[model samples]
Target: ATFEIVNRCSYTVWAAASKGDAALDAGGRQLNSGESWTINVEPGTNGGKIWARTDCYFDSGSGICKTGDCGGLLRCKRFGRPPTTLAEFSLNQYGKDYIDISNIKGFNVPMDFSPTTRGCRGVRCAADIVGQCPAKLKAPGGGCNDACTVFQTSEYCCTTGKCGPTEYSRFFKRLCPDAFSYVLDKPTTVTCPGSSNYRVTFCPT
Candidate 1:
């Protein structure tokens, strides 16, 4: 499988991708404006996530990123912290490509995931969730927080798997309706067959 990680934002964004506990594409890379990195993974690669880190400061110690900080490190070894936008994918699943943009954890940057191949439609979730974030759900560094992160309740976290979108999640859904806003928001997932190339763009226009 192949993933084209594109950065259209004005500033630099450190793109991170990981599969389980294994690092992908040497962990991550710094993408300047209009720059992009393409990564190739083995077939059937699953449980992988890609995200962008912004406003990062580096030193000898594990660096810190204002958004999408994974273990406060420059190279992500795990999934990003809450309030970070994510592009999750499972390749060659049930004879199709399984992918989705998830805001169930929250949003830091605008993103879009689309198949570059024909015969398959694409899905995108692009909005200024940070700027319009409710004051109570705002993360310190300009990311929008999910209700589960804020309240930590079973209802908000959907620990029981019976919960639906809350008003807080609806706030996000209204802006990025195609992205997952809550636990049961699987309707947003997109699937397709064949070796279709995918483009995961950050700060997409």
Candidate 2:
């Protein structure tokens, strides 16, 4: 019989804003969802970090956010030693009655790198503003043009009662200089199974 990890179903956990918090344990391992490397899991090492966003991407040679990954079902698990290659490790909303995956990394990784308390959202939001985006755009009431772009668009805002993008994605080179300039163009579309409304912006990969 083929060995299957078994659909244990996405686990439901809680994450208070803290880095390397032992309370947030994946069985026993310590994962930092904030830094890089999409989802970090070591099978037996249960504990790993999960970024607040669900998407994946690589940093530039200069070590900076510059692109987004190709579209697909991205779920990778690297099992080796010291460091492993986690090309795919997306997060999902799961739990009994309600959905929760306790993202401890969210508390560690700031929203931005520009000497501000703001997080990636701050810079991303700036990008959206320059893109002339509205708090909500689906209804088509905002005065955005065909050129505007939306970073990290999501549907959870509509269903889960949260207001903002869900995944961590961008237009790659599409948004430069003012990390705030995210993509809001209507035609360029990315999709997440359980998300809509909010969008992350950076540049195209």
Candidate 3:
């Protein structure tokens, strides 16, 4: 169950991955454009998230990024803060492997998350979110923010794990049809066999 993380963005990306409390890729690393890193997943892992932090500078054993910083650590042991583009997955949940790209937190980069194996659908969000972001949903530095991130309301946050899409989410949906624009967004999950390998590409071409 190998996953290859490829950086295709023009600038450097601080790639991070985590499954529950376990960190993948030795807790994360920097990926220059055209670079990639591969990690073997432990089967039966129930949850995972992979994302990239931008414009980071580590000093005195810590760092901060314009986006996706995890407690200011160079080697992240935790999930990134909100307003992040997320590559989310579950390995062997019950039986099938599932993968999806999430813009629920927000969109910071174009992403492609897909199985390298057959019989599986791929997911990507290659939208110009930063340019089209609603003024209320625009985040600092670069990237957009979700209503949930800005308003923190039950209707937007779906804290009960149940809610429909909002206008802001619809905006996101218009940009990326296959991403999680809200908690109950449908047609976002892609199922695959446990034996399949996967690839997560940033700024995918």
Candidate 4:
């Protein structure tokens, strides 16, 4: 015989329960043997409606929103619908895709994340391909703090007005220099694996 149990909240914690002499404590994967050890099912019964919910957090600063507890050091919000009864929630239903504004009129004006990183803020892709990762990813390089008269400055700047880490323009630079080329088609699409009776979708529009 089997009794189905589920996580009440996305809040994860280790807990146990008892069902008479066949004690069963179950929660968060760990199970034990005792007066009421942990099992996969809720050994007891609530006799009422049960619900489940899952969530992902957002970082207000990094602009990165990710799943799981980031050690409670998260700048996120509860962004999914609570389940009623036994329905399962696939991640895509809770995901927000980057809907392109260019298709909509009146979005001609440029917007940026900062005073300088203009035109560098959107989830961009190669004009040539869909979901192609950019090849220019590199470790940031150091910039010239002093006079540029000694070196040619033309290569360091792109038409977008963004600067490169190297005083000499190189798109394939790395982190320390903190420079990046404008990735017009950075993949905004994350591919979640699909299963029978389940599906996935990607939107670049």
Candidate 5:
């Protein structure tokens, strides 16, 4: 499998990917506008997630991303902190590519994940979440918030299992119907045969 990460935004993006303790695509790299980076995913690997950090300022071996900071490091060794859009995937799982766009942790950028080959549908979240974020769910550094971030309750977080969707999560689902808006959002998962390659586009037009 392969991922072609394309940056179509006006500003620079620090694209990141990680699988468990391992990193991908130079761990993380700076992508200027109109630039794209490709990384090969080893066959039979389990899964990973990809995202972008915006308005970053890294120096002296440590720094912070305005949007998707991961321990304030340029080369991310872990999953990004919340309030970031995510494109997640599990490769060669029962011979299928399990993928989805998740805003359950909130959103910082627009993203589209699609197959370069056939047999899979694409998933995207292109909403202007920064501009439309609710006042209570607004995060610093140009990111929006999820209900759990704002309230931190079992109702919003669904951590206790016997929970239902809240108005807050429903709001997110309304904006991005195909994304993982809440913890119980199972129907949004997209699957394809394992033979397909994928493309991830930032600020997709």
Candidate 6:
């Protein structure tokens, strides 16, 4: 499947995508406002993802970002670190493809992870989350935090299937209804036709 990633935010961003252990095309490149990048994945690529890093500066073979850094590599070898908005995909599985936008980690950008192909649904999480972030889960640099990431308590992370949303998760759920707020939230995942391409837009207007 093909994914076209666009940066609609006012500032620059570094986009990255990964499938399993490998980086998809070593997707670690700068995208100025209005710029876009494309990535093509094989038919059976699952556990794949695309995300953006903000307030980044890459130089001298290493880099740093206010959010979504992947262990200092400007060119990716690993999945980005969280408090990130993830556009996730499971391509050509069985008779269908699956896609979703995740906030289980946290959120740094507003996103529209949508199908370019006809007849499939898209998931958008475009609320003004960072500005409205609760003081408890607010990040130092930017973005907001998931309680599971911030508190690391059993109450937040449902290792077992027996759990429900907490107040902090409700904060995210209220803002980005289509994106995941915690691990157990399942209706957010979308099943799409196998022969479909997608668009991943950051800070979508």
Candidate maximizing TM-score: 6
User: What lDDT score is found at residue 97 in candidate 1?
Assistant: 78
Candidate 4 or 3, higher TM-score: 3
- Can you rank all candidates by lDDT, best first? 6, 3, 5, 1, 4, 2
- Displacement of residue 14 (Cα, Å) in model 4 is 13
Instruction: Count backbone overlaps in model 4.
Output: 23
Q: For candidate 3, lDDT tens digit of each residue in 14-87?
A: 88888858787676789999999897777876778899888889885497888888888887878887678999
In model 5, what lDDT does residue 11 have?
81
The TM-scores, one per candidate, come to 0.94, 0.16, 0.95, 0.14, 0.94, 0.96
Model 5 pairs whose backbones collide: none
- Any runs in candidate 3 off by more than 4 Å, and if so which? none
Report clash pairs, candidate 1. none
Q: Global lDDT for candidate 2?
A: 0.20
Cα lDDT tens digits for candidate 5, 1-205: 8899999989899998877577765668889999999988776656588999988888854898887777887777788887889998888887887889999888988999999999978999998887888888898667898888778898778888776777778777888998988888757888889857999999997
lDDT of 2 by residue, 30-145 (tens): 12332221112222222222222111232321111111111111221211110111111122233101111111111111122111121211222122322433334211322221
Please, what is the whole-model Cα lDDT of each candidate in the order they appear? 0.84, 0.20, 0.86, 0.20, 0.85, 0.87
Scored by lDDT, model 6 comes in at 0.87
For model 4 the local lDDT of residue 32 reads 20
Task: Residues 115-203, candidate 6: write the lDDT tens digits.
Answer: 99986899999999899999989999889988988998887888676769999989999998899888888668899998689999998
Candidate 1's clash total is 0
- Model 4 whole-model lDDT (C-alpha atoms): 0.20
Predicted candidate 4: what Cα RMSD to the true structure?
A: 20.6
Error of 2 at 199 (Å): 20
| Model 1 ranges with Cα > 4 A deviation | none
